[PDB]
């Protein structure tokens with residue numbers, strides 16, 4: 001049983017489409033337990049100045065009961081069967097999923113459909129959640145990492161839709177109407193823009209059947225079955241600096257525009273990020289870590305942590321890094337960081353990519369560790385690539401990557417580009433934009 | 444009195460041209476780099 005063989009013997013992912021336009025996909029295994037959910041192509045990016053944070057507001061009511069069954073009833077029924085109900089809303093994607101015994105795959109599918117189609121939107125529950133959401137905005141405001149990434153999007157995509165945060169504005173949350181949420185749901189939670197995904201011990205045909213039974217309400221016009229292409233979001237080389245020397249450590253995020261889901265180069269960018277890696281003060285490896293940047297961080301105590309990232313989207317994306325450091329080590333950290341980025345475009349080695357490729361393989365395999373994560377892969381893949389991509393395909397693609405390819409792709413997206421910068425906390429030591437911009441060439 | 448009279452003036456001619464050119468190019472570069480600060484915006488967002 002070799003790695004190759006195990007990859008080929010993995011059960012295939014089955015997909016079928018209903019007449020209403022909804023897609024049903026699932027990967028079958030022999031597990032008494034399973035996860036099934038509906039991945040919707042909706043998010044803050046689809047909102048606008050007036051209904052920003054509606055998709056989030058909805059995510060708060062999607063579990064407070066439907067028309068067929070009020071709050072208590074809905075909750076009791078789900079709880080009493082040992083099932084877990086979770087979900088989330090991002091900028092371009094939303095999801096509501098359930099974990100339970102394969103023995104209930106069908107009852108669950110009915111529950112899901114009831115959630116996405118007949119949300120009660122209890123007028124009173126809405127005012128109750130209005131205050132809850134307002135408390136979460138103050139909680140999240142202390143999450144420097146997330147405040148920093150929000151700011152990164154706020155400036156990198158300023159003037160556009162991707163500039164808004166998922167949770168939305170205070171004004172919006174204070175004034176969103178029962179009608180707005182309703183409108184949101186109707187406008188976005190639509191069959192062709194959704195995906196019923198399930199993984200575990202489930203019958204694809206039994207899944208698709210319960211699907212036909214509950215996911216119905218077909219469309220008449222053509223405007224109801226077309227998936228609206230979103231207007232492009234302009235990337236802008238710039239920086240937003242939120243200074244507060246009262247904060248203990250500083251967060252910094254730098255990034256360049258990325259390609260977008262469908263682009264093959266993403267396989268290389270991920271290998272690239274694998275070379276630089278990530279780090280945090282609890283990595284036993286210490287000064288021996290393969291990641292050069294990580295090694296330097298340890299030697300010179302450059303930061304508390306740092307991480308690379310390649311955040312994709314339909315038509316764009318953010319490729320960069322983020323670090324947390326003491327006010328007095330920001331400059332050296334940024335220096336070494338930008339240094340490693342130059343090394344990438346200019347002097348990557350075969351040994352380097354070899355390691356990074358391996359690291360990347362076990363990374364993709366790790367994202368399929370359980371029913372929920374695999375179910376998440378399916379929902380996302382069909383929603384982003386319009387098809388599931390096997391580990392064997394990925395591996396096929398990953399294997400083709402070499403040093404030269406890394407240098408060329410990185411040079412393409414990084415070298416001499418104007419980055420987007422977001423800095424929060426005690427950032428006096430972080431040099432100006434011009435100096436950082438110069439770190440973008442020669443290495 | 445000034446045997447270099449003519450050559451002096453031929454140089455003055457080039458000095459003037461090169462200078463015009465160079466001064467402009469450097470003026471742009473100075474403005475280019477400084478644009479970052481020149482258009483920079485700021486705000487005071489004190490807590491609650």
Ligand SMILES: CCCCCCCCO[C@@H]1O[C@H](CO)[C@@H](O)[C@H](O)[C@H]1O
Pocket residue numbers: 445446447448449450453
């Ligand atoms: C004032 C009397 C000038 C007589 C010389 C006429 C030539 C002026 O012309 C200049 O002369 C210099 C030295 O001769 C040269 O080095 C320069 O290249 C030439 O352009």
